[PDB]
Amino acid sequence: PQITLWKRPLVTIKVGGQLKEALLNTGADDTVIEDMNLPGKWKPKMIGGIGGFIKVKQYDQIIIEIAGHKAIGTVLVGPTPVNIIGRNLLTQIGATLNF
């Protein structure tokens, strides 16, 4: 697909057996998903952007499907205002920026 940027580039994802809406985000390497009760080991992390930092849980090797494309990698879970798919998983689904 080609996604123009008039509107937020939102897609459906599947993670932890749940469907969610998420924003395709070239602005960070990591993926951040809103609080959800994912099973297994995690490590505390703090990530910072406009407005400051939030505390998240870093989960590794999380299976996540993005607009019908399978991926697996690190997923940060925490009180982000918007689910954001970062460059790490964008590369796995073959996403590029074009102009």
> Which residues in this chain contact a copy of itself in the complex, by CB under 8 A?
1-6, 8-9, 23-29, 32, 47-54, 67, 69, 80-82, 84, 87, 90-91, 93-99
Q: How many CA atoms lie within 13 A of 38 on its CB side?
A: 27
Lookup result for tokens 């399978």: 70
Among 9-17, 43-51, 62-70, 91-99, which window interacts with ligand 017 (CB under 6 A)?
Answer: 43-51
Q: In angstroms, what is the C-alpha Rg of the chain? A: 13
The nearer residue to a copy of itself, 15 or 78, going by C-beta atoms, is 78
CB 19 within 8 A of CB 13: yes
- Judged by beta carbon, residue 21 or residue 29, the one nearer ligand 017 is 29
